[PDB]
Amino acid sequence: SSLYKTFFKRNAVFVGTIFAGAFVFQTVFDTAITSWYENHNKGKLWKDVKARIAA
Amino acid sequence: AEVTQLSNGIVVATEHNPSAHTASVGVVFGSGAANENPYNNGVSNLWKNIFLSKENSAVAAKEGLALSSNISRDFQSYIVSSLPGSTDKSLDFLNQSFIQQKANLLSSSNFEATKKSVLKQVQDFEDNDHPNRVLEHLHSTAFQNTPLSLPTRGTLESLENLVVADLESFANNHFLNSNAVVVGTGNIKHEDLVNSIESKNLSLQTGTKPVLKKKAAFLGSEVRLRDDTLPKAWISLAVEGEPVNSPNYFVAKLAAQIFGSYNAFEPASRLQGIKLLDNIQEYQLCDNFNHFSLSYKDSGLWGFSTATRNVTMIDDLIHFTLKQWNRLTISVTDTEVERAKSLLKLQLGQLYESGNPVNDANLLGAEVLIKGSKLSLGEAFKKIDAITVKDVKAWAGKRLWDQDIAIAGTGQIEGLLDYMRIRSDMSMMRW
Amino acid sequence: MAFRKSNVYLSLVNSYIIDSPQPSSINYWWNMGSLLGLCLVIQIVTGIFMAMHYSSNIELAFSSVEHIMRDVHNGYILRYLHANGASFFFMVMFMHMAKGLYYGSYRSPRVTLWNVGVIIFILTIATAFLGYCCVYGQMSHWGATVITNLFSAIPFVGNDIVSWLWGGFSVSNPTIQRFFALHYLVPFIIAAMVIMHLMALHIHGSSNPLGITGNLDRIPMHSYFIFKDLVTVFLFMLILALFVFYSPNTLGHPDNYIPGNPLVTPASIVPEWYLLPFYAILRSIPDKLLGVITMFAAILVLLVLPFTDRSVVRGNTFKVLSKFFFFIFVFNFVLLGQIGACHVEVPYVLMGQIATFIYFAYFLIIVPVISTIENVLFYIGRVNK
Amino acid sequence: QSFTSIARIGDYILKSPVLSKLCVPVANQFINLAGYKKLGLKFDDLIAEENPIMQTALRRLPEDESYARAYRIIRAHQTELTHHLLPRNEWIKAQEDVPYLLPYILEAEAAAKEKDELDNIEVSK
Amino acid sequence: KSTYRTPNFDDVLKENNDADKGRSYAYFMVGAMGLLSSAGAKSTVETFISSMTATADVLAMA
Numbered sequence A: 001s002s003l004y005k006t007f008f009k010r011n012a013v014f015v016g017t018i019f020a021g022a023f024v025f026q027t028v029f030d031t032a033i034t035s036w037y038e039n040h041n042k043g044k045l046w047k048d049v050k051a052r053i054a055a
Numbered sequence B: 001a002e003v004t005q006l007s008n009g010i011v012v013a014t015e016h017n018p019s020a021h022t023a024s025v026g027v028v029f030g031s032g033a034a035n036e037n038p039y040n041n042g043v044s045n046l047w048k049n050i051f052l053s054k055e056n057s058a059v060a061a062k063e064g065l066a067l068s069s070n071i072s073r074d075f076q077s078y079i080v081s082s083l084p085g086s087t088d089k090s091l092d093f094l095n096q097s098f099i100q101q102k103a104n105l106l107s108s109s110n111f112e113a114t115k116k117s118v119l120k121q122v123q124d125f126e127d128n129d130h131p132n133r134v135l136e137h138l139h140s141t142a143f144q145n146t147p148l149s150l151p152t153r154g155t156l157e158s159l160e161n162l163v164v165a166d167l168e169s170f171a172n173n174h175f176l177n178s179n180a181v182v183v184g185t186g187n188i189k190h191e192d193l194v195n196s197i198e199s200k201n202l203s204l205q206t207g208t209k210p211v212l213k214k215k216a217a218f219l220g221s222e223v224r225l226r227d228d229t230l231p232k233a234w235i236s237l238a239v240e241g242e243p244v245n246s247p248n249y250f251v252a253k254l255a256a257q258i259f260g261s262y263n264a265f266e267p268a269s270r271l272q273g274i275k276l277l278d279n280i281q282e283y284q285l286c287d288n289f290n291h292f293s294l295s296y297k298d299s300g301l302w303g304f305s306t307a308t309r310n311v312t313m314i315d316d317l318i319h320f321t322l323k324q325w326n327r328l329t330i331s332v333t334d335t336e337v338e339r340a341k342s343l344l345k346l347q348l349g350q351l352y353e354s355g356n357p358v359n360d361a362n363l364l365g366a367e368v369l370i371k372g373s374k375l376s377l378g379e380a381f382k383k384i385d386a387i388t389v390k391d392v393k394a395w396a397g398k399r400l401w402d403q404d405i406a407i408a409g410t411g412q413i414e415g416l417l418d419y420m421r422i423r424s425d426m427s428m429m430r431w
Numbered sequence C: 001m002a003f004r005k006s007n008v009y010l011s012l013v014n015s016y017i018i019d020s021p022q023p024s025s026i027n028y029w030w031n032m033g034s035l036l037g038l039c040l041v042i043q044i045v046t047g048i049f050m051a052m053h054y055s056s057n058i059e060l061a062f063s064s065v066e067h068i069m070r071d072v073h074n075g076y077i078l079r080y081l082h083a084n085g086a087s088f089f090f091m092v093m094f095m096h097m098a099k100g101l102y103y104g105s106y107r108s109p110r111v112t113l114w115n116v117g118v119i120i121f122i123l124t125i126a127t128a129f130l131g132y133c134c135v136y137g138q139m140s141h142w143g144a145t146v147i148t149n150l151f152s153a154i155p156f157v158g159n160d161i162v163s164w165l166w167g168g169f170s171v172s173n174p175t176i177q178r179f180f181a182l183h184y185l186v187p188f189i190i191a192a193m194v195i196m197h198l199m200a201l202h203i204h205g206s207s208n209p210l211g212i213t214g215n216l217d218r219i220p221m222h223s224y225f226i227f228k229d230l231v232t233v234f235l236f237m238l239i240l241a242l243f244v245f246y247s248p249n250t251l252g253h254p255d256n257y258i259p260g261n262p263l264v265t266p267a268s269i270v271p272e273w274y275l276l277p278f279y280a281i282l283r284s285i286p287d288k289l290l291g292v293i294t295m296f297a298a299i300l301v302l303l304v305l306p307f308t309d310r311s312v313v314r315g316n317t318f319k320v321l322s323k324f325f326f327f328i329f330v331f332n333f334v335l336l337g338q339i340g341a342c343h344v345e346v347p348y349v350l351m352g353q354i355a356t357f358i359y360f361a362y363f364l365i366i367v368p369v370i371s372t373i374e375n376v377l378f379y380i381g382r383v384n385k
Numbered sequence D: 001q002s003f004t005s006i007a008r009i010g011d012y013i014l015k016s017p018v019l020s021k022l023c024v025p026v027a028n029q030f031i032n033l034a035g036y037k038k039l040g041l042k043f044d045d046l047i048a049e050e051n052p053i054m055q056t057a058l059r060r061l062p063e064d065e066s067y068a069r070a071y072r073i074i075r076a077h078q079t080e081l082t083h084h085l086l087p088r089n090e091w092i093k094a095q096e097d098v099p100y101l102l103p104y105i106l107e108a109e110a111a112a113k114e115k116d117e118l119d120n121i122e123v124s125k
Numbered sequence E: 001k002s003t004y005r006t007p008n009f010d011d012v013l014k015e016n017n018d019a020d021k022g023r024s025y026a027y028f029m030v031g032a033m034g035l036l037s038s039a040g041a042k043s044t045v046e047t048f049i050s051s052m053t054a055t056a057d058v059l060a061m062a
């Protein structure tokens, strides 16, 4: 695949890039999951109930 | 190395050598075992042997002539040697064996006798010549289902199925003027030969062309001929090398000179300035090894061969060797490159500046068939000196670093680990 | 072959304890290793049995040790064996290490053996620290406090590491409970490390008092050394028994008989005797960071000996200058301990600083200088020109 | 420390009348205090052998001296294990305390040094 | 049969399209696995490490 070769030119991915990619992934994935999860439960969350019933 | 060449239908090539005492004249065809197929494989070897048959040799002996024939992958040769003056008798013989006695050599009595001999030849080789047998299988697997895969001596199966017709079929398709170069080495002059040839005329199947086929390809693979009854383990391993006349032809040969060849039993061999020797001599990992950079028309093989009685430490032998190769990409030293330059020159010298004319004939013929001319040693030495560490690293990063390999071996090879383990050693881990 | 050699399990016992080829001349100093094995076993066995009646909660810790002392049948024997046992463990480890220093045991090809040993020393000290904390007396609280704070010297993340170790705002309930959990763990890691120690010892075998090859005259471990070790096993037990039943508290501190108090650090605070020299080293540096570094370096410098000893022969047996300085070092080590037991006062402070320098100079200066001089002395004292 | 280095410094002192009159006596004293001769060993018997240079040297040592070395070593371990010394008439005398292995050691050291230099030579084109 | 005649491997051998097809796919898979394992290990280590930080019941600032 040329999409792979443009970045790694026939070499495997080195640890440095692996660890570096893990750090980025860890944050991007958390945001994506939390948003989906919270959106899926829109209405049930405390935040949602706190806005409406302003107590 | 005087480059003298002339064309008038037939392409004549000579190389005068003041100090010689003898002369060699013959014809070199641009076809070899690679121009054969799985079924007529061994046909060229067959032609070589009928040309050297007792009958056709007794004739040449009375005339004071010696017969020579060499079957390679990209070419074939038939050479006649004689004194510096009898150069004309030589031509009369070539003119005879390929125009006159063409039928006498293919008689039922002669063919059957020759076929029976090469049959016994090839069998003894497959039964006893383990290092060459293995090197042959390296080609067989590395280039499987491609031209360069066919052994030069041919196989037993195809050999015993060959008939007189096959020789002719091959001969009509390959022993042609357009796929030939008449060679003359020793002390004979260019004009002296060109006139002796121009004396006779005719043609006999002229204006034709050799057949075409499929392009040679390297396939990462292996073939294992395990035989526990043999005393050693013989193995050859290599990556796709450089085809003759390639930008990295010399860099590849230099690279192979760095790791060189070794013979555990010879004192001086044990002292060579080769890093790898520090690692293999402690536990005596092998009896010998030899690196090579084989070059052909379409491809090549770069690697090494080795023999060992150390059947329990073969993995260390292979590990240290491939580990050294990794170095060519990331850390080959300046002085390793310089030592190789010197030693490479010396070897090319011993090859091309051999005292023997038959060798020069084969070298001359083969070279002009490909690049039209023979490579001058002085130009080779300049290219070799021009090589730098960067050149070497660039070459290894392309041909060596993390590339597929071809493996072949016979004997006590239980200790030779799986393909993937060997394959993993083609590179090193890093950050 | 014999079942002891062919069986998968027995062959291990056979190679290490039965047919193991020992240098015919190893003296009693080579009995310290078997003694350390006994100590570890004693410590583990007594600890487990006490563990059955102990409570790590900071409010029940001290009283549960009192419960073991008063209500548990033979409980006071378990505790005194454990407590005094820890002390003997260090006295024997100090002798084992000193034996190593004197006979060049650290020299090639036994460098790994020595390094793993340094690992064991560190784990053993940490284990002892953790165990002492579990009693939760005055010394326990403040010791936990001072030692965990050692890490606050690490720049930037320093204070977070300490809060993480404590599990709170100060040494408290979560600190004692994890410390007891950890105290239970490490002895098993040490054992694992001991096995590695023995594996390194085994490929090269023991050295000997002469410092030369033992290959020409070996005698089997079984009988000769199995019985020679028994001699020291019994003397070790006899002396430990003297302390356990007749003077069970002379090696400890009375302050640890007072429940820990977070608001009061006793003026009579003093670390456990075996930690005193390192305590003195740290106390000699008028800088927080440099102080902890130097103290930790005091242990790590043991790793440089294989490289600072330039002698062409292993061991001090035939070396007058090396023998003299070896004892300077030993006695300097005891003085460092005595300094540690004193207050931060005029004569003592300078003495500690001077003794601290002597401690490091031995490994970094004296050993390499003296060994080089002795090499030449042995040469010119015989060769003619 | 290499014996080449020890010898270099030692020879220098041994050739200098001033240093030689000052050091040698102290060295003689040192060797007598060392006490290895009372165990029946020669100094060269004390050299730690677990390294390639010494293994090379001990390999090259002639058969007869090798058997002699073995005896002195075995006899020493035995004497040491009994906590005694050998009777005076068995002590190695100064005349006998000869550097028999030293020449083999220096030879082995020089060969390794050259091999190390040759393994790392630079080239000037 | 001659050992020189390699048996048929056509059923698994890819054609002369892109030689690095197997390579690129192989290296991407291993890279992604390595990438995800690292994130997993990091979060596993952080899960245990944090279990030692001050508990909810002791964070009370009186």
Ligand SMILES: CCCCCCCCCCC(=O)OC[C@H](COP(=O)(O)OC[C@H](O)COP(=O)(O)OC[C@@H](COC(=O)CC)OC(=O)CCC)OC(=O)CCC
Pocket (backbone or CB within 6 Å): C026, C027, C028, C029, C031, C088, C091, C092, C231, C232, C235, C236, C239, D083
């Ligand atoms: C506070 C916590 C302490 C815990 C540690 C307890 C264990 C202590 C170990 C002692 C030790 O390692 O000392 C070793 C030195 C070296 O000694 P060596 O050169 O090898 O011995 C030659 C033998 O006489 C051979 O003689 P033997 O025939 O084997 O009998 C020896 C002697 C051994 O006694 C022992 O228990 C050894 C200490 O038995 C007796 O005659 C004693 C009768 C009452 O022995 C000495 O010189 C002792 C002075 C330091």
Ligand SMILES: CCCCCCCCCCCCCCCCCC(=O)OC[C@H](COP(=O)(O)OCCN)OC(=O)CCCCCCCCCCCCC
Pocket (backbone or CB within 6 Å): C029, C094, C095, C097, C098, C099, C102, C209, C299, C316, C317, C330, C333, C334, D080
């Ligand atoms: C972190 C680093 C820690 C290291 C610190 C060191 C540990 C502290 C020291 C504790 C005790 C260790 C004493 C020294 C270790 C034993 C020394 C040794 O091995 O001595 C051997 C020696 C005589 O043996 P030879 O084999 O050399 O005799 C020649 C025969 N031809 O035997 C002798 O010369 C006699 C032995 C005399 C021992 C007196 C020791 C004094 C110790 C003070 C006790 C501490 C209590 C307060």
Ligand code: HEM
Pocket (backbone or CB within 6 Å): C029, C030, C031, C032, C033, C034, C036, C037, C040, C093, C096, C097, C100, C103, C104, C105, C106, C110, C113, C114, C116, C117, C118, C120, C121, C190, C194, C197, C201, C205, C206, C207, C208, C302
């Ligand atoms: C739990 C603690 C330890 C155990 C069980 C242990 C056990 C042993 C044993 C059984 C031996 C062989 C007999 C002997 O020489 O006593 C030995 C040898 C040795 N140990 Fe340890 N050891 C421990 C800690 C250490 C430490 C802390 C060091 C070093 C800092 C050390 C250094 C050595 C050395 C150098 C030898 C080889 C001595 C020689 O043969 O000259 N050991 N040990």
Ligand code: HEM
Pocket (backbone or CB within 6 Å): C040, C043, C044, C045, C046, C047, C048, C049, C050, C051, C054, C065, C079, C082, C083, C086, C089, C124, C127, C128, C129, C130, C131, C132, C133, C134, C135, C183, C184, C187, C190, C252
């Ligand atoms: C290398 C082994 C060990 C060492 C050096 C060690 C050391 C110590 C020390 C110094 C103390 C405080 C002694 C005091 O003044 O009372 C202690 C206490 C304690 N240890 Fe250990 N210990 C070891 C192994 C064990 C094991 C394996 C356990 C757990 C099963 C254990 C359980 C305890 C308990 C229950 C206490 C509290 C009771 C007491 O004060 O003795 N110990 N330990």
Ligand SMILES: CCCCCCCCCCCCCCC(=O)O[C@H](COC(=O)CCCCCCCCCCCC)COP(=O)(O)O
Pocket (backbone or CB within 6 Å): C034, C037, C038, C041, C226, C227, C229, C230, C233
């Ligand atoms: C972790 C290490 C802790 C301890 C290390 C000490 C090593 C010594 C172990 C002693 C085992 C002796 C067995 C002798 C044997 O099997 O030979 C038997 C003879 O056994 C006997 O005569 C028994 C004598 C009483 C042994 C004393 C028990 C020791 C007390 C244990 C304390 C150790 C904690 C072979 O005898 P034979 O050779 O004459 O035919």
Ligand SMILES: CCCCCCCCCCCCCCC(=O)O[C@H](COC(=O)CCCCCCCCCCCC)COP(=O)(O)O
Pocket (backbone or CB within 6 Å): B424, B425, E030, E033, E034, E037
């Ligand atoms: C107590 C035992 C429980 C677990 C047993 C399971 C055994 C699996 C161990 C995995 C180690 C892989 C090492 C491979 C290696 O070094 O090859 C290296 C290559 O390593 C890689 O490519 C990275 C692989 C990253 C994924 C590893 C899985 C992460 C660990 C997950 C948690 C497992 C408990 C050699 O590669 P080369 O063949 O090209 O020369």
Ligand SMILES: CCCCCCCCCCCCCCCCCC(=O)O[C@H](COC(=O)CCCCCC)COP(=O)(O)OCCN
Pocket (backbone or CB within 6 Å): C006, C007, C008, C009, C010, C012, C013
């Ligand atoms: C921290 C541990 C580190 C690990 C090192 C392990 C070393 C073990 C030291 C203790 C050895 C003592 C027990 C060995 C038992 C010898 C008898 C034996 O192996 O008989 C075995 C059968 O054993 C069993 O069925 C049960 C063994 C359970 C062991 C429980 C501890 C006979 O085995 P055998 O060698 O004869 O096999 C012949 C080939 N068919």
Ligand SMILES: CCCCCCCCCCCCCC(=O)O[C@H](COC(=O)CCCCCCCCCCC)COP(=O)(O)O
Pocket (backbone or CB within 6 Å): E037, E039, E040, E041, E043, E044, E045, E047
């Ligand atoms: C070494 C013992 C731990 C083994 C647990 C494996 C059983 C599967 C459940 C894992 C849950 C624990 C972590 C968690 O909740 O994180 C969750 C993510 O878990 C994963 O990705 C788990 C994949 C496992 C990869 C681990 C490879 C091995 C780790 C070795 C460390 C040296 C949540 O992450 P987070 O806190 O949001 O950052």
Ligand SMILES: C/C=C(C)/C=C/C=C/[C@H](OC)[C@@H](C)[C@@H](OC)[C@@H](C)CCc1oc2c(O)c(OC)cc(OC)c2c(=O)c1C
Pocket (backbone or CB within 6 Å): C122, C125, C126, C129, C139, C140, C142, C143, C144, C146, C147, C148, C165, C182, C269, C270, C271, C272, C275, C278, C279, C282, C295, C296
């Ligand atoms: C969870 C595990 C943890 C946190 C492990 C930590 C391990 C730390 C070190 O072991 C490797 C450490 C024990 C070791 O340092 C190298 C010792 C020599 C420390 C010596 C030591 O003791 C003291 C002591 O005992 C006290 O008692 C009341 C009081 C003390 O000051 C007043 C000290 C003290 O000032 C020092 C330096």
Ligand SMILES: CCCCCCCCCCCO[C@@H]1O[C@H](CO)[C@@H](O[C@H]2O[C@H](CO)[C@@H](O)[C@H](O)[C@H]2O)[C@H](O)[C@H]1O
Pocket (backbone or CB within 6 Å): A010, A011, A012, A013, A014, A015, A016, A018, B402, B424, B427, B428, B429, B430, B431, E030, E034, E035, E037, E038, E041
């Ligand atoms: C215990 C739990 C911990 C899990 C942590 C996960 C660790 C992941 C490590 C991942 C990759 O580590 C990385 O691997 C690749 C091979 O895959 C290595 O690549 C090496 O082999 C490849 C494959 O032949 C070569 O192409 C390459 O040139 C070579 O450098 C790379 O140099 C290394 O840096």
